[model samples]
Target chain A: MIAAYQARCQARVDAALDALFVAPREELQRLYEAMRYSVMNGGKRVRPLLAYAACEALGGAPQRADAAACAVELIHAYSLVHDDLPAMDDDDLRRGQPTTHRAFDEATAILAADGLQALAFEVLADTRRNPQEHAVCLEMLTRLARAAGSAGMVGGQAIDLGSLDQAALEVMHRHKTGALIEASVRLGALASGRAEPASLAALERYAEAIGLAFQVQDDILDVPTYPALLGLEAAKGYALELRDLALAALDGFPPSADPLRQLARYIVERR
Target chain B: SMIAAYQARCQARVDAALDALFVAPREELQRLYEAMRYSVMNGGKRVRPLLAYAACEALGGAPQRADAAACAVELIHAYSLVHDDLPAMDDDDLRRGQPTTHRAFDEATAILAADGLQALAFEVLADTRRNPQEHAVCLEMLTRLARAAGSAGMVGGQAIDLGSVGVALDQAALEVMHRHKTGALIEASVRLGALASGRAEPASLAALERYAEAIGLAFQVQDDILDVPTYPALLGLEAAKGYALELRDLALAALDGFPPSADPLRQLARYIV
Candidate 1:
């Protein structure tokens, strides 16, 4: 049901993203190309979709969240590129195609990852040019950078290297995907410039629940999710509980927030 | 001589700021944190920070005012070095005689470490911790810093350097290469400081822009003279020195509008040559 919304938002961000990889000077062409190759690789833009959907929940126009959409996806795309280095996962393919490093080379991939993350912050910072919009834009930068940096993705990645406990599992899972997922929501709402601290907090709480739900799905079917850890049917109940919390968080939001509620269910029901 | 003193004290704070930037959230991530500390604290010259401090001073701002921008630029430079020394990049095992990040840790950790450093760089500016700057100023700083570090800037320069093997570069291309590779961030360092200063005059900021660009070019030729093992050999050492002095003069001339507060910026022009 969300597929049409999903397809349209992906194309929206895709167009915004393609415009950013330009090489002002021709010598810098390959660097730009490697960035495009990694980001434009054929995976679904889940983070961008979340950003757009979150904004829509807050009655923000889709264009208003476009920068957030591009920024989070850029961070995700680059993380995967950095993760796929021969020294990292050494995987040749992400989807059905060669990874950035394999398709180009290790050096290009490293630079592309760095470039992508740089643009991630740049897009957020430059999202608005008006004098009044400055504060919201800065808010966007700090949240996204913190999410992308050590406190979120990188820190979780650091711990994920050595932990197996559920606390450890949840922490790593949250950061690896959930942290940025939360950021996508925060950024989307912040972009609306209409989000107050109360709205922001409730929305982020909802986001964390959704992120954990995502973790459950990934860990489930294969899978422990909670089944292997918390036991079988309990896992779905846990899913239901999280789904309800996610639903509850949005209870104050108008019908404008339905896409967000739909999204939580989408996370719950899929696969 | 005074600039020498500035560089010393300037490095002390930047080092402290950088080391504090990487406290891992968990014990498991300490390796990642250590890798970040190891690369940044590994005895490199704090050239970018020096420029930042001097640029701030020239604009009637204190080094403390420029500390975030200073640390961020250095982090950007430090991350580049870590990635540059990777097995797939330069394949170098050591930097300044210390083990490179990947050599000291696993390559994957090095990737994450460098990635962490870049993220922290942007965060430091955006957060402006200890003393937050005005919003418009910080936003401009973050935007400039990102552009300086991204594909259009340092990263792009390296790719161009790598791709150069397939084609011959004219002097024009060579200049573009150095400007992107070595110049963009140095200029950004100065502009960051200029912006960090609450009192920055547009004339003074514009002047420093020219100065930063001139010094950026001068540093490359001086580096070659000190040894990239390229420019001095490509052209004669005497010619390289001549070009270095020309750029140095250009840098110094750009500072003519400033008071003695800018003396450090002036002093650096001669110091680099």
Candidate 2:
């Protein structure tokens, strides 16, 4: 039943995102189009969905949570776009389509990512959302801003550029990749308005487990990972262990959060 | 004012902002900060800030509004310079008669400088130093800055500039390119000052728009006129001057309804060519 729900939500997200990209107006036209280019052709949107679902699980409605979810996805999208730049990945294809920097010029791709990052916060700060929610919204935006910025995501990318080996690379990925996903769950909970101080502590534990699992799970599925030396099967087994740990940590939550609990189950079950 | 005096005044403001906003540790971030300061110090006509000062003075804006507007435009200009100096773009070796950022530092450092400058723009707009209620003003500034700097604004204009470089373009194509690239930021300078002052009326705002458009084109025209033999594809001297005069007329005409309160702007508009 949850799978059916998730599939439906994914389609809605894609469609809403499609409308956002194609909308012709002043700022919306360019940002929406760039955003679509970032997440449209590919990207799982798991980070955003996780945000929405976590918000819902914490008692916030998905409608209220959608903007926050979308915001995180924008951050994800922008990072990927810049990562694929000639000064960076120089990736010609992403998710079976030409990357933004590839489809458009490099500067277009760079600025698109930059614009999307700004738009993520702009959406939250916008009047369309509840003005009363500004503080929490500001917090969510600021935290994500730090995570995606020179000190966090971009910092991670810098480390990736400097790392001499696989082990060195892993440290960078932990900060760069895991940071955003961990923030996604926490911010979603905050956006849901259900996050208490204690819950944030509990959520931190949940984040660590899932954050590692997020990477480990990717390692399980992705055969040709960046670090050529890390074998696929070893990575996959480690991922399953990480998944178990993640589920174990979430045992504190109510059974009603079975969806969140099952998210862990789903990862390992896919294997 | 003579160009030399304008340059000196602009430099003093730039120096003050640099000291206040940046404190280099001579450590890990020293390189990045240096690259950023290089872009800031790199000489250009400080037209946007001048617009902010003139507009605010016309509107009876307080000193705070003028300072913020000037700082913000300098940030915008600095970041644009950093990115434009990259190897992928114009590949220029000098700016303001100094080593371009990429030459002063590696590509990584240059990129980081650009990123930092962009963040600083948002930070200033956020004005965490101000009261919490002022935060929304910061939000509004961020919104405008993003629009001006983003794909639909400066970035979009830049992409067009790059795409059309050496490619044949009609006057409309060129006009569209400059509108976003140059005009958008200039327009925002006035708009931000008006917003910050809390004194700007809708009619006055509309007049400022006309004023900004006029000066933006005039700035471009002057650049075209100043183009040396090294950059020969630039517009001819007489044509550039003609465009400047036309824009000046549009600018002067926009203020016809306003009383003498807006006369300073009118005076400045006449002197540019």
Candidate 3:
């Protein structure tokens, strides 16, 4: 059941990305094509799924979360492109495909990332969304800028290259990965018209817990940094611990939040 | 005399606003912030900011209302220059007669500085301190900004410029590239200023559009005349100067219905030729 839902959300996110990056009339065919290439080439679509699930948890229609889903995923794609640059992570392969810099030249890749960042806000600021969705649009735009700007993801990336203790690493990851993840849930909840302070406070807790859990699991499986710092078994335990915290945060919500509950478990238990 | 003094004041206004906006750089991102400040504060003409302020004044809007839009447009211009001067792009070592961002910092820092500045541009626009109604205006402006800065605008022109180097471009294609590359943002600067004023009527906006297009093209024509064997080569220096004058006149003609309050914009077009 969870797999089917993930599949549906991922498909919707891809369609939105394709529509957002369509080619222009005059020129820039290559640049537009490059943007589409980076985004259309698939990943797990975890961020968009979180957005969808969080909105669902608030009893909002799935379509209400579409802009939030697209905005967050666009930011994710752009960050990955810039991360894989020769100066940064220097990875040649992402999702088993040529990294943007390798597939297109370095300048095109840089501009592609730059353009995508702008396009993310453009997607959120689109006035054409349902008038009912207008209430959250400004907050959505501000949240995204804060999440992707220097104090959040970009600043965290700068610090990741610095020497760090375990505590600093956690702080860095909280901003780097955790900020966008938290924003995904927040944007979803706000888009759903659930702006009550207490409800949002709980959702924030839930998001924070799973965001870190998502990173801990990633470190255990993909990167050698965090898991090596804390022994592998310890890191696995950490993930499960945070997963439990996430589920507990949702205890105040009714069964409508089952999708988010399922998502928190998936963050820890996914192989 | 007053216009020149006011232009200087507007330049300083944008500089101060940008300085305040980027303060308290974090330890981790100190170098990034430094690079951003260096590029942004590096002395340029601040033409876009001046245009923004001038447009706002022309519409009788408060100067404070124009502050954010002025700084935002200038930030976009500064970021564009940083990226355009990179080794992979125009490969320039100097800008405004000083070492370029990539020359002063490393290539990576230059790239990230440009990226960060672009993000900050939208952030500054959406910031609500400028006015209670700013969020809505900001959202509309951001959409325009992203459109102007994205594939169909500045980046697209750079793509054409890269592909067309050493290969001759016709006047039409060259105009298209110039219009997209620099003209789009120039046009946006004027439009955003008008939008910031919250007082622009439809006829006034149409006039500003005409004025923006003429000067947008005129600014490039002036640049080519300053350099060698481009627009001036296609049309002789005399004809190029004449063409610029014609554009300036067209720009002035668009403002005929406006009162003396728009003299700054008039002087700006005159400066172009």
Candidate 4:
């Protein structure tokens, strides 16, 4: 049931992204293509799912979370694009496909990522149609920007570029990967228009636990940093502890939050 | 006479605001902020910031209120230059008679600096101090600035500019390109100030639009007149100058409805030609 729900949310997010890059002038079609390729190319859509589930848990409709979902996903996509550049990770392959800079030349890839970053804030600040929600939308934009900016994702990447031990690595991942994941949930809940301060705080706690768990699981699957730092068994135990913490944060919510509960389990249990 | 002094005053204000805004940088992002300051603090004409200030003053608003908008527009301009100077873009080594950010630093630093600046632009607008009571206005400014800087505006124009290399562009095509590339931000500069003032009427904002469009085109025409492979190359110097004069006249006419508060904008348009 959770898998099917995720599929539906993925479809919605994909459709929203498709509508965003309908067309550009022929002269600039390459840019549009690069942006669309980076954005539309498949991911698990985990960020958007967290957003949708959080919003729904707060009694908000799934559609309300669309902008927040897309905004976070755009930031995520752009980070990956820049992170894959030759100067950075030097990775030629992402998801078994050529990286953006590899597929398109470096210039187009850079500008495409730059344009996507601006487009994220543009989409978030869109209130001409939803004039009533203008203030909160601004709040959401601020939240997303702080998450994506130097203190958060960019700063994390900067720190990682230098030498790092286990503690520093954890700090880096928390900012680089965990901040946006956390914001994904907050933005989703905030957009619900029904979220109270207490509820939002609770959702943040749940998101924070899962955010770190997601990163720990990634490290375990990819580079084995945490597993190597603390023994593999301890790393696995840590993931379990985080997953339980996330689930405990949701105890006050009704069963409507089951999707969020399922998501926490998925974070640790997934391959 | 006053225009020169006013320009200086506005430039100083913009510089001060930028300095204060960027002072307390995190240690990790220190180099990133340094590159940003290198690009931004390097002096230029400050035309966009001046336009923003002039528009705010024209609406009888406090110049202090427009400080953030002015700084935001200038930051956008600075980042665009930093990115545009990369080897993959214009490949220039110099800007404002100084080494480009990429040249002074490195390509990765340049790229990250530009990225950080763009993010900073929106972050400034989202600051509650910019306009506490009317948060909606700040939102409008954010949206406008983003649209201007995004693919639909400056970046779109840049793509076309890049693609147009070694290709001849007709007058109409060139105008469209300039309107998006440079004029969009110029227009947004005016709009951001006007919106931030909270006193500008729709009609006056529309008038500023016409004025902004005129000066935007006129500024580029003058550049073509002074440089090579320009509008003058196709339209001829005399015709290009004549067109610029016409735009200057149109810009002046747009302000005929306003009181002396708009004199600064009028003076700016006159100075363009």
Candidate 5:
């Protein structure tokens, strides 16, 4: 099954991550190390694995997958680190690890996260990844920076800060949760060294569906645990039906897109 | 040929290296790139690149090391300048006789400039390839840069500076603060240049460190002297220059055992004072 393959691919990625941080004995290195430590702690590694699987599913090699996988992981790392900072969520817990600022000193953690976020784009231009994939990866990087920075992820987070009712909260969820997940799929396709319009379209559909599904599931799980919640189960169920329309929009892709099909299946089935 | 002519010739080389550092496919990040170039291109002393050139000349090294090392330090400095201008930080309006990047552009552009500049700095170190000896130095430069620019060093200093604002710092706190802020990168510039010389040795590294530490405090002393109108008045102008000259002498004396080509080391020490 692809699960074992995905697990092995993640292990390979975990080992290579250590090589990226071989900085000398400077304070900046320590800050970056703290950023890396907080972000690279145990997690699903889903974004990178999905990137690699997308490449492999397209008859590409692991080498071709490197930049995309690293790119997504970097964006993910950057997002989490920034999200945990004092100016943002100011949370102490992230994936069950000390947020960067909590583990290290606050300022170091802040700068470390900031530096790591910059390093992601730097990695895109770096030659350690395939030259053939470099341009599109750069494109993905610019896309990611826009999405994760002020106008996208952080913007979404800002919306959540105000006391919002049902309608506004959903809109906030769309940008915060949906845009990144959608970008993940779109970016994964680009990282595979192809910018095919149809592939992008299909993946976009798949991402839109699963992104909302993932959110709906989270909201559903939250609703039962906390009574007099923001939304009722019937209303949430309607949201799940809306996600089905998203999944069905990509019915034109080839049979090889079965993983995407299965992802949609697995996401909705969680309810 | 006269040293003046050689110096002019070397200055052109440094300028070209500086161009290489800032001129890139910044079309995607137009505002960010412009802000970066605005800070780097105009008028900060190209001290680090000059160090690379001087160190290379001392070791009979080529011009290539000077080129890459210049690019590396300039990038580091550029990023630091960008962040230092943010609203949460120094909030200065003028830098290098131009509008601070955050002022010229927006805060977002300034932040992107800092991020991109730092990334490009390490990328130069990783990509510079001349020889095995040069490669080792470049690799070490990467390691040195990450540490200097990252949490433990410059950024750490900035944090401390922020927290300590309005509080009277003892000389030790002030020294510790600037050591990470300014000293780390200065140390990096010296090491990188020496490595570029492809003749970097333990003795030379130590000598360079002695020189770097001396020049670092001297520069800071002069800076503190220049900014006396600002606040807390670290040292007097005459006292600052006195310290600089004393440190300069110490730096030159540390280089006594080097070969005859090491004369620029003496000249640079005097110039900084």
Candidate 6:
């Protein structure tokens, strides 16, 4: 049942994004193509879905989340393109398709990523298209920048994004994964323009648990047994623990949060 | 002389603001922060920040109001330097007489540091806690910064420049490359300062726009005289300098209606050529 809801969210954002992919000049036609290739490829829109679902949970219409959804997705897409750069993740393929650096030259990929990152801010800050209040715009821009900046994954101000200890793993998860997920939910909630401090805090708690749950469960889904640093059974248990914590954060809400509740369960039971 | 006097102090203020912005614990992301500082703090003539400050002052804005825009543009310039120095890009080993970021650090760290710098740059502008502005005005600045830096501007020019390397492009195409590459951000600096001043009445703003465009091209053309571009090759050294001087005069003329506060802008154009 939630599948269709999720599918619709993906459809709206991608369609909106497709229109944004054109190059402004003939000289940059290739840049537009690279930008589109990097972002428009079909993939699970988990980050954006979190946004729409969170917006719905807060009684905000999906239309209200257009900027938040597009901006988060733009940033995430650039992260993926950037992550696959040979100097960084060195990935040649992403989900069985050529990565940006692979599809185009490395130089083009880097420029595309830079362009996309800049556009993420541009998109969010444009009130004409998204109609966000000044306060809402600032909050969203602030959240996206911090989550993607040095404080989060890209800065590597710590031992790096992964491995060896649960304590360390928790840190990586919190910044690399949890931070943006928290932002997505918060953006959606705030997009309503009526989200109270209490509601915002509650959604944040839910985001924290589910964010790590998505990552741990992702690790689980990778092998159907989880061959990550932690033991298979131990990691599996952790996912269940997180999913429950995720659901509990939503207990204060009514059926509007069902998508989030079910999504949390899906994190633990997706296979 | 006042332009000379204003610059060193202006440089110090911007450097200090940037130093406070880039910090961390040694054991963790210290390496990334170090690379970030190394790239940004390496420093140069700081023409970008000067334009920002000068533009702000031209509109009767206090220096403090221009801090965010000034810092943001320099960070953008620094990151572009780092990225352009990558093996896949210019493949250069040195920037401003020091080893490039990738040369000093490994390629991966250089890459990540540059990415972080770009993100940090945006983060600096988005701050509402300090350097406050009307939300509407604030959003406009962010949008302008991104557009100027993104594909339609700086990055786009970068691509054309890269493609034209060793490949002959016509004089017009060459100017287009400079316009997008260096011109966009330089112009952005002037505009950001005007916007920050919050007193950018139409006439002054348009005047600054003309002033920035001429100086931007003049600055780049002068560099091409210093090195690269067969800008001299296309227009010859004498012609290049001649054109640069013309632009400088135009820049001065654009600010002719303004008061003494614009003297720094007037002086900067003459300094460029």
Give the candidate number with the greatest lDDT.
4
Segments of candidate 3 deviating more than 4 angstroms: A130-135, A222-224
Cα lDDT of model 1 overall?
Answer: 0.84
Provide the interface RMSD of candidate 3 in angstroms, 1 decimal place: 1.7
Q: lDDT tens string, model 3, A60-93?
A: 8877888889889989998989889887788999
Show what share of the native A-B interface contacts model 1 retains: 0.83
User: What is the clash tally of candidate 3?
Assistant: 0
Candidate 5 chain B: minimum summed lDDT over ten consecutive residues — where?
B23-32
- For candidate 2, the TM-score of chain A alone versus the native chain A is 0.85
Tens-place lDDT digits, model 4, residues A1-271: 7798789889999888888885456667888888898888878798999889998999888888898888889999999998898767878999999999888877778888988998999988887422327767877887888788766787677667744467777777887787899899988988788888899888989988998898789878885288888878899999999999999999889987999999888889978
Q: After superposing candidate 1, which stretches have Cα over 4 Å from the reference?
A: A127-132, A223-227
Cand. 5: chain B TM-score:
0.86
Tens-place lDDT per residue, model 6, B42-74, is: 867677888899999888888789899889999
Query: lDDT at B212 for candidate 2?
Result: 85
Interface RMSD of each: 1.1, 3.6, 1.7, 1.6, 7.7, 1.7
RMSD of each: 1.9, 4.7, 1.8, 1.9, 8.8, 1.9
Q: DockQ: which candidate is best?
A: 1
DockQ of each: 0.80, 0.25, 0.62, 0.62, 0.12, 0.70
What digit string (tens of lDDT, one per residue) describes model 2 on residues A1-271? 5576567556755665555455333423544465567877655677776776677767777666666677677778877887777776778988778888667667667667666665666666664652326567656656665566555565566556644455555566766786777777877788888778776666666666666676666666665253245576666677677677767766677754666677776765665
Query: What value does the lDDT take at residue B146 in candidate 3?
Result: 76
Model 5, span B1-273: residue lDDT tens: 244454566667766766654543323333444666776776565676667677777777775656777677777787788777766566789875678887887665565556556655655555535222443344455556665665566666676666566887776778777887888788777777787777778888898888888777777776665665211354555655677678888888778788877777677677655
Q: What is the lDDT of residue B141 in candidate 4?
A: 89
lDDT of 1 at A96: 78
lDDT of 5 by residue, A155-235 (tens): 455445433355565666666677667666666677666558776776677676676677666666665211134346665
Lowest summed lDDT window (length 10), candidate 4 chain B: B20-29
Q: In model 1, what is the error at residue A73, expressed in angstroms? A: 0.7
Each candidate's lDDT (Cα)? 0.84, 0.67, 0.82, 0.85, 0.63, 0.84
